[PDB]
């Protein structure tokens, strides 16, 4: 299938205590591979996936140098924004950023992106053509005019259509065995009594990768969406994911209900019945 590389930045000011805290992480698909924390003793970009340790010290020197610059620029950015909004200095504020690129299943460029948010709401985003921006409010249009006066986009465009895709293709080869795998879900059902008239039917998918998956119940064939709980997909802590879906059923009707499971690693979709 398609693949993606993505970096996530979070800077959070803390007035009255120290300087703002900066946290960057990088992902290929649903696998983390690098991190940086401006509060940690190390002060280095550190590895978080087996297949990235095979990069030499030039790799870690450039990435560290670059990530630290970005943190300083964001401590500046926090200050500028609290001017555009006329906010006090007692208040904690947040800047988040996501950027990266997608390749299609043949390896070719598909999409690059960069979006920024302030206090959890869109601030400014790069358009899909990689040559203009969209702003969310008045304050952000000051930034949109700045970046149009200089020629920022061309720089953004060079990274997204260039180094980003190129390093994503390299990562996809080195960690072939981690990143191009699919682990099909391990599935089963459980049964619990709510009382005497009803009982809970629970459908489990475990140890799957990548995280995308669909659990649907069908009593007699209609996509049952009443009395069905459906928990947010969650990480197991070892690289795989978990999910379940329940449905309350009346004692004696269990055999009506089937569970249906789709996942990329499944030769066909799965059906489970109590």
């Amino acid at each position: 299938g398609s693949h993606s590389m993505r970096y996530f930045y979070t800077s959070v000011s803390r007035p009255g205590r120290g300087e703002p805290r900066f946290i960057a992480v990088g992902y290929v698909d649903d696998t983390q591979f690098v991190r940086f924390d401006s509060d940690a003793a190390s002060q280095r970009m550190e590895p978080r996936a087996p297949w990235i340790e095979q990069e030499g010290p030039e790799y870690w020197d450039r990435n560290t140098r670059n990530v630290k610059a970005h943190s300083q620029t964001d401590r500046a950015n926090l200050g500028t924004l609290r001017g555009y909004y006329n906010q006090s200095e007692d208040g904690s504020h947040t800047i988040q950023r996501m950027y990266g690129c997608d390749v299609g299943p043949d390896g070719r460029f598909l999409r690059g992106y960069q979006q920024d948010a302030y206090d959890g709401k869109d601030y400014i985003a790069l358009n899909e053509d990689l040559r203009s921006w969209t702003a969310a409010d008045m304050a952000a249009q000051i930034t949109q005019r700045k970046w149009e006066t200089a020629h920022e986009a061309e720089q953004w465009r060079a990274y997204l259509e260039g180094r980003c895709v190129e390093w994503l293709r390299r990562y996809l080869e080195n960690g072939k065995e981690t990143l191009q795998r699919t682990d099909a879900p391990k599935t089963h059902m459980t049964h619990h009594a709510v009382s005497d008239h009803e009982a809970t039917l629970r459908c489990w998918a475990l140890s799957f990768y990548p995280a995308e998956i669909t659990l649907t119940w069908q009593r007699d064939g209609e996509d049952q969406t009443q009395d069905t709980e459906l928990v947010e997909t969650r990480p197991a802590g070892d690289g795989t994911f978990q999910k379940w879906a329940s449905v309350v059923v009346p004692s004696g009707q269990e055999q009506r209900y089937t569970c249906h499971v789709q996942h990329e690693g499944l030769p066909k979709p799965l059906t489970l019945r109590w």
């Binding site: 970096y7 960057a24 990088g26 970009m45 790799y59 450039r62 990435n63 670059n66 990530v67 610059a69 970005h70 620029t73 500046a76 950015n77 500028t80 924004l81 950023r97 950027y99 960069q114 920024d116 400014i124 000051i142 930034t143 700045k146 920022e152 720089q155 953004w156 990274y159 180094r163 980003c164 390093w167």
Partner: peptide, 9 residues
């Protein structure tokens, strides 16, 4: 590989 360009508002 993180970007080399900086983004300043």
């Amino acid at each position: 590989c993180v970007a080399d360009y900086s983004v300043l508002y």
